[PDB]
Structures are given as C-alpha cells and as structure tokens.
Design a protein around this ligand. Sequence first.
Ligand SMILES: Cc1cc2nc3c(=O)[nH]c(=O)nc-3n(C[C@H](O)[C@H](O)[C@H](O)COP(=O)(O)OP(=O)(O)OC[C@H]3O[C@@H](n4cnc5c(N)ncnc54)[C@H](O)[C@@H]3O)c2cc1C
Ligand SMILES: Cc1cc2nc3c(=O)[nH]c(=O)nc-3n(C[C@H](O)[C@H](O)[C@H](O)COP(=O)(O)OP(=O)(O)OC[C@H]3O[C@@H](n4cnc5c(N)ncnc54)[C@H](O)[C@@H]3O)c2cc1C
Lengths: 460, 458, 58
Amino acid sequence: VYNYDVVVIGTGPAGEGAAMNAVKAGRKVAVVDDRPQVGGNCTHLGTIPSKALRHSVRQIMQYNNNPLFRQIGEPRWFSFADVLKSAEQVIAKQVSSRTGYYARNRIDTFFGTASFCDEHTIEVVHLNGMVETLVAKQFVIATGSRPYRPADVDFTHPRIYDSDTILSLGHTPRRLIIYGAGVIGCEYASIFSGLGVLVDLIDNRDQLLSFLDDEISDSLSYHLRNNNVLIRHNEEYERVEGLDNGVILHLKSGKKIKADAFLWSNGRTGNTDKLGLENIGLKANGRGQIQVDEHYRTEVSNIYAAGDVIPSLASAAYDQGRSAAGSITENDSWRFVDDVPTGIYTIPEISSVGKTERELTQAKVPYEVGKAFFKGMARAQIAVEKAGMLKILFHRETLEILGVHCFGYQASEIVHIGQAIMNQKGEANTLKYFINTTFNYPTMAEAYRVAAYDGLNRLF
Amino acid sequence: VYNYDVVVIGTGPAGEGAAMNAVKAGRKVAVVDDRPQVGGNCTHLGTIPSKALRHSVRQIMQYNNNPLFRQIGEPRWFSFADVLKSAEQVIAKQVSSRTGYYARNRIDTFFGTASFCDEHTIEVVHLNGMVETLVAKQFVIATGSRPYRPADVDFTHPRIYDSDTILSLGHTPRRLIIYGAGVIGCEYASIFSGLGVLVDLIDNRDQLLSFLDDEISDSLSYHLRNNNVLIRHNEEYERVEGLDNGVILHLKSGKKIKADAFLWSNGRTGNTDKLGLENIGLKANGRGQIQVDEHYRTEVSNIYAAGDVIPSLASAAYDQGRSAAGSITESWRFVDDVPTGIYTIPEISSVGKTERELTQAKVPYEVGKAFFKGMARAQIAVEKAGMLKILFHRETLEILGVHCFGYQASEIVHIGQAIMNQKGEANTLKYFINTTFNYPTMAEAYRVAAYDGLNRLF
Amino acid sequence: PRRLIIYGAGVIGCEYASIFSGLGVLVDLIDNRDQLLSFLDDEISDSLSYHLRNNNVL
Ligand SMILES: Cc1cc2nc3c(=O)[nH]c(=O)nc-3n(C[C@H](O)[C@H](O)[C@H](O)COP(=O)(O)OP(=O)(O)OC[C@H]3O[C@@H](n4cnc5c(N)ncnc54)[C@H](O)[C@@H]3O)c2cc1C
Ligand SMILES: Cc1cc2nc3c(=O)[nH]c(=O)nc-3n(C[C@H](O)[C@H](O)[C@H](O)COP(=O)(O)OP(=O)(O)OC[C@H]3O[C@@H](n4cnc5c(N)ncnc54)[C@H](O)[C@@H]3O)c2cc1C
C-alpha cells in the first residue's frame, strides 16, 4: 500500500504533462500505466511510429526523384521492414528521455493495469501478479483510447489490420484498402501511396476532412488522386471477407474491392472500460469518453480527466493534462484547451488555425483572402516541394486575422507564426505586422509576406 | 529618351521591392540592370546558389549516414559539378517568376549598365556600345556590392577564387583554405566540410562571429572542428603564392598553409565605381557604401539608396527597398531589428540582445534552454545536434533575446520574433505556456524552453 | 485589364475565366453554388478548380 498526493493513470502526453505540472507545484505525484515502457500510445503506437514511417517514405521519394542519386543506379524500391526499422532508435531515445524526466524528479511508476476500488483507492495489477493498493487525494485519468473494433470484422485475420497492428506488416502489399477518411486514414494512405502501393481510400462523407477549408481539402484530394490514391466518396461498408491471398470489401452501394491487405481507421473508442468507473459513480458514453467541465473535472470532485479520454491530439492532450494538474493545484496555470491548430501529417502536410472560409461566409464577416503559392517560393523550389499553398483570411476593415490555412512543405512549422499573430488582442492582431517585420530568407515564413501583399492589393 | 516617375538601379531584392511598392501606389516605374537576367545577386551568384549547394550537401550527408540506403551500396563521392547542377533549375524558376512579376505590372526593364549624368537623367550602356537616356522624377539606388579584391591577391590565378567565381570550380579539392570568418566564409566552410574537404578556415579575430552569442559561437566552432574544419584564430595574411598544383598562404605569424584551392570571403565593396556618382556630387566611403538618413534618402532630395549598397541581408534589403519606395510615395518603416541568420550545417539564427549585452546592461534576465537531442522532431529528422535558448526578463517575463542553432533554426526563430514585437504585457514568456502547438515539431521546443525558464523563476 | 471579376460559374463563365487567366489577369470567379459545375463529376470539378486556383483564378 502506497500513499501519494496525486495519481495519474496513463503515461501519454496528458499523463506526463499532468504529473510534471503537479510535481512542479511541490506535491507528491505517481504515474500508473499498463505498457512495459513509458510513453503511452503517442510514442509506441501513435505519433512517433507513423511519423517515422512518413518521414522515411518522404526521404525515399525524394531520393528516388532526385537526379543526383540516379547516377548510382536505377530507382529501387524498399521493403516495408527496412522503412519501419528507423523508428526503433527514435522510440528508444524518446522512452529513455521520458524515463529520465520522471527519474530526475523522483516520480514513482507502476507498470500494471489500474482498476478502481473506491473514490480514493485503486489497485494496480501487473502481468506477473503485482497487486498494489494506491491511495491519493487527487486523481488524473489519461488512459487515452484504442482503435474502434466492430464485431463483424475479423481482426484476427492476418490480412486485416487496424491503426495499431498495421505496424506488424512484414512485406509491402501490392494493393491496399483503407476505411475511414480520418486523420489517421489519410496519413496512412499518403504514406502507402508514397511507398508505391495502390490504395483505395474509402470515405463515409462526400468531402475529405469536411472540418477543413474547402480549397485545402480539394488540393489534398487532387494530390492523392495524382499519387495513385483512389478516393471513393459517400460509402458505407456492408461486409469484410478475408481470403488466403487478399481481403474483399463489399460496400452497401454494391461495389466489391479486393486488395492484398486492409486497414481500419474509422474512429476511436475510449480506453476506460477496464478502469471500472462504477466504483465512483462515473459513466462512459457510447464512444468510451468521460465528460469533463471547463476545469477538466469529472463528476467526482477529486477525480480529473484529460487527453484522449474526451480533439484527440497529442499536444492538445499534453496541454489538457497540464491544465488539469493546474486546476488540481490551483496555481494560476489552468486554461481550457479549445483552439487547437489542426494538423494532418500527410505528404505534403496540412495545417489550419481559426475560422475557415465556410464559417466566415455563414457569419457574413467582411473578410478578404491573401494567397501565397509555394511554387513561387524559393525554399519550396529548393526543397523540390513545388506543390503547396498558404492562405490568410483577414478582416477587410480592422485587418484582424480570422484564420490561417496552409498546405505544403513544413505546414505545421509555419502555421505557428500566423497562430501567434492571431492570438493577439485588438489592433495587435494585424496583417500589417507581416509588412513591418523582417523575416529570414530564403525560408517558408517569407511566403507570409507575399501573402500579406496579395491581401493588401485586394484591399482598396 | 524615356520618361517615368521613378527609376530603380539593380534588380535584387531591394530594387524589386522598391519597384513593386512604387507601382502599387499607382505610379509609373522603371528598372535597370547590368545583367542579362533579372534577380541580382540574391538569385544569380549569391543567396540561391549557396543555398542550393547547402541543401544538396545536406541531402548527400543524410543519404550517406542513413542505414536504410546503405543496403543499396557503399557511399559514393559526388563531384562538385553534379552537386551544383541542381541550382540551375532553381535559378531558372526564380528568374522566370520575377520576370512574370515584372511583366504583369507592366514594368519596363533595361539590360545595361547605369551611369549618372544629373539629378533627373541616366545613361544605360549596353554590351555592344549604346547610350539610352532615361528620365525619372525619383531614383532608387540598389547597386548592391561585389566581393572585395585586394591588390596583392592574384585572383586571375585558376586556383584562387572569391565568393563569386568559387562556383566555377569543376573538381572537388582535397584541401581548401578560406580567409575571413564572415557569414559567407562560415557558410562555405560548412559546405566544403559536408563534401569531405579538409577546410582550413582562417579568422582575423579570436572568436567566430563575435557579434553572436558566446554559446552559439562555441557550439558552431565545436561542430566545425568535429567536421574537419581546422579553425585558426588571430591570423592576418601576409602573402599568397599560386602554384600549379596548389595555393600556399604565408601568414603574418609565420604559418604557411598549402591547399588545392583558395577562397576569399573578407568583406564586400559597394558597386559605386561605375555609377558616376561624381556627376551628382554624392560621396561614397572607402567601403563603397552610400550614406542615407532614416528615410533611406541620400543628401539629394530625389535620390534614394537602399539594400546591400548601404546589414547586408537579402530579406533586409528587400524590406529596405520597399520602405524607401513607401517613403517616396508617403507606409514607411526603418529596417533596424533584422534577425541574423547563418545557413551553415546546422543553421543558426538569432534576434534581440545577446547574453553579453544583457550582462553589460545589468538587466536581471534568465535563460531557458531546450536541447534538440531530446526533441522528438529533431530525433526523427536524424539531426540531433542543436539547442534553443530564450532570454527572458526575470520579473516581468519579457523576452529580451532568442537564439537558436540546429535544424530549422531560421524558421523556428520566427515565432520568438513574433512574440517579441508585441507591446507591454502581450510580449510575455507565459504565452508559450498558454498556447498549444503542433506536435511532433521543433516549435514544441519553445514550450520546453519556457518551462526550463519557469523552473529557474521563483 | 489588370484585374477582373466574373459572375456565374456556367460554361461561358469558366471558359472566359480560363482564357483571361491564360492571358495573365487575376480573375475572381464568383459562383452561386458550392462546387463548380455540379452537374459534372466530382473528381473532374475538383481538378478544374485546383488548376484554376493555381492559375490565379480566385
Ligand atoms: C497513427 C496515429 C498518428 C497520430 N498522429 C498524431 C499527431 O501527429 N498529432 C497528435 O496530436 N496526435 C496524433 N495522434 C493521436 C494520439 O495518439 C493521441 O492524441 C494521444 O496519444 C493522446 O494522448 P493521451 O496521453 O491523452 O492518451 P494516450 O497517450 O493514448 O494514453 C494511453 C496510455 O494509457 C495506458 N492505459 C490505458 N488504459 C489503461 C488501464 N486501464 N490501465 C493502465 N494503463 C492504461 C495505455 O497503455 C497508454 O500507455 C495519432 C494517433 C495515431 C493512431
Ligand atoms: C554566397 C552568398 C550567400 C548569401 N546568402 C545570403 C543568405 O542566405 N541570406 C541573405 O539575406 N543574404 C545572403 N547573401 C547576401 C545577398 O547577396 C545580399 O543580401 C543581396 O544581394 C542584397 O540585395 P541587393 O539587391 O542589394 O544586392 P544585389 O542583388 O547584388 O543588387 C545589385 C544588382 O544591381 C546590379 N548592378 C550593380 N551595379 C550596377 C550598376 N552600376 N548599374 C546597373 N546595375 C548594377 C547587379 O548586377 C545586381 O543585379 C549572400 C551573399 C553571398 C555572396
């Protein structure tokens, strides 16, 4: 039996941020997770592995399309195992760094499944048979989520995978079917298209990423189509059948598609069933999520939830966990993480912040559009990333930025300047900043300047 | 004899920006250049070729050190010509884009050397012997500069190069000597270190880039030393001897260094000799620069000078030209706070006061550090060396200086610059705690740095 | 002209927008619907919109 001030369940970004913020306040913190190593889904099955796969695919594509390396020989494909091999060193380094972060602050860890006993007591059970009783005054729930698994899909089939088991692939398939047009599905479709796999992306809606700007979605769809990705719209699956050599999907519309593999990316379910929320009066909705208020507080006053258990973004989860820890400690570090810069790490990347075009049109705001195309950008030309764009929506009278959308090379790393300018108050948030500020050159931030001018010419 | 409201000399960033801002005002503009193509040194001989060389060398290094590509075969050294070949497509695209920009706004161009006659006319002299007369109410001077050529150096020797003709190299040398520890010198030292050339960098001072922070300079020096860049400090050249099989530099201290090539990167002199400034009474200093006020206006009321002809940065020159054009048409700012950027391997960028200036001013500041080795994006980019430092006021949390060195340093520094320019309490460190970034990116490094500051704050 | 505005996303409007964009003028096509030529295929309309936007047709 151990006693602590605050106990956090799950060692993902939310749990790590909550524990670090709470221990920074002078309290005693503990962390519980079921994985054999620290890091959570973000490092072991989420952000890090898929991002390493994407970066390796991009490097392979650039090497193949670079004439300088064509003197070495004819273009050569790479096995999926060799591509995935690069992620092991990165995940090992990340887990080592996180363990060092925990150890340097004297943070106690327990590597076992956590179950609830009462409002202040939990039992951690390891695989071997640890049965340790933990009592804490404050609780943080950061158990994340898992891929949604419908019953009628034989996930035990060797040729059917989800967003987690897809990394178990040993050989590169010739054909692939991806279901669900979510962020994960689009990212994996882009990665496998870069690898050279004819993948037939399936969408339940008519437009990919309807929450994004219409032009950005159109450009992404066109690029995917030009990159061997076949996009089908307004489709719902009827039956998935595994075979010896492939997987056949029968849609409700009547189309039957056969591939050499299958990936499911349609939604996620909260990983809270094993916790046993009935011992504290808490309940989980149909998606497995936990309802929280603006203070990230559950129905129980001393129990808090943050992260994927409620935009399902790793940075958003980390900030939500830190805010929940601040609410626990009440050290003027609480904030409701609501404005999250949307980022899709396809090839090329996509990012957005603030209002889109359709919302502005619906609200009848007198705005204007400033565009800067990456094809004319020195850095984009020099990186051989010719495709791309940057769009700035700015108020036509007050010159206040209402939304920034970018699609191309280094989208996420240049959306941040627009985000910083947008967050300013009143006249401080002005497009004219991009004219009265000297940037570097040749970089991607220079596009902002061009975009600004492309707005100012449209202003009379 | 043509007539326009405003004429521009030089088609670099300063001239292009001045012309664009002037034509935006509804006036009539003209441009003159002595090169057969538009763009200036920013595209033809300066920024773009060196950046292309840097990106190609970085890609070569990434391919060489990547275990995935090693299965194909053993590393193969790439000739300098093949590496430089990638720049031709980029310069062609840039010049086509700039020509389209000029033609879209109906901008007249004159491909010839410009000479002054009086305060309202100039003569354009072509290669085959013309004079064309141009008259403008307002004048913009953006003649830029050229590499400084001392008399005692035989630049006509095939084995002796400057910052311009170094691109004429056809074979990769084994050993190379760089004189001058300037931005260009350090950049080219990094380039040739990436290509496996035993560079012997020569510095006239004791510390590389003394205008930078001590920590950043020390890290850059350590990386260069680990990348075969033998750095010699406090050295002044005495004589240069060009052999058939090499170049031997005899220093004032008595050291004699032999290489297979030689590169001079010590300073630049403004292009004012052939401008005929004596026809207007304007005066240029020994450095070839033109003195202007805060309006970017010369002593003559209707003559303006902007750009490298006066921080010598392409973006700074472009903004200076646009500011001068705005001053002509009345939308004007003085380009003073230029974020310094050195595009070596890895890159360096900085904005605001350094730690030494803050110590001298006795401002009670504090340091927040975020090391790239622990950064997920840096680890996944295989580029682990690097750091990001934020200097913030201890009491009011006001950011007084941002320094970054590593991967994507120049693009990273822009967020800190954007926060910096805010007024009063808006420019606060706690912004990095009150905003969610994209992950995994290097921008998250800022967040870490902020926390590394807040722990030191009590 | 230096700039131009086209109202109506019909066949004639799109043809003139493409022609003028080829001529090198910033055309601002205005549509009463959410998709250009909704009676066409979605992929074809998306490709046409991408090309027009890439050719200064806002
Ligand atoms: C392929 C892919 C790519 C992604 N890319 C991005 C991206 O680029 N950016 C982004 O922001 N997000 C991305 N995500 C989303 C990311 O996975 C989540 O945002 C993030 O993992 C949520 O953080 P969290 O700490 O709140 O939850 P998690 O990190 O998922 O926390 C779950 C942890 O709790 C443990 N746990 C769960 N239940 C129990 C239990 N009963 N007992 C004990 N331990 C338990 C798990 O073992 C795990 O360690 C991606 C996801 C996927 C699948
Ligand atoms: C190797 C190298 C790398 C560099 N890298 C960078 C970098 O990464 N970032 C950065 O910001 N800066 C960089 N620079 C500096 C960059 O070259 C200058 O900042 C830039 O030239 C400034 O613009 P400008 O128009 O004043 O210069 P220029 O472009 O040189 O303008 C001068 C133009 O006018 C013409 N001209 C000159 N004299 C006359 C005359 N008498 N009559 C008519 N026309 C004339 C010239 O032919 C030229 O076209 C680099 C320079 C070098 C040499």
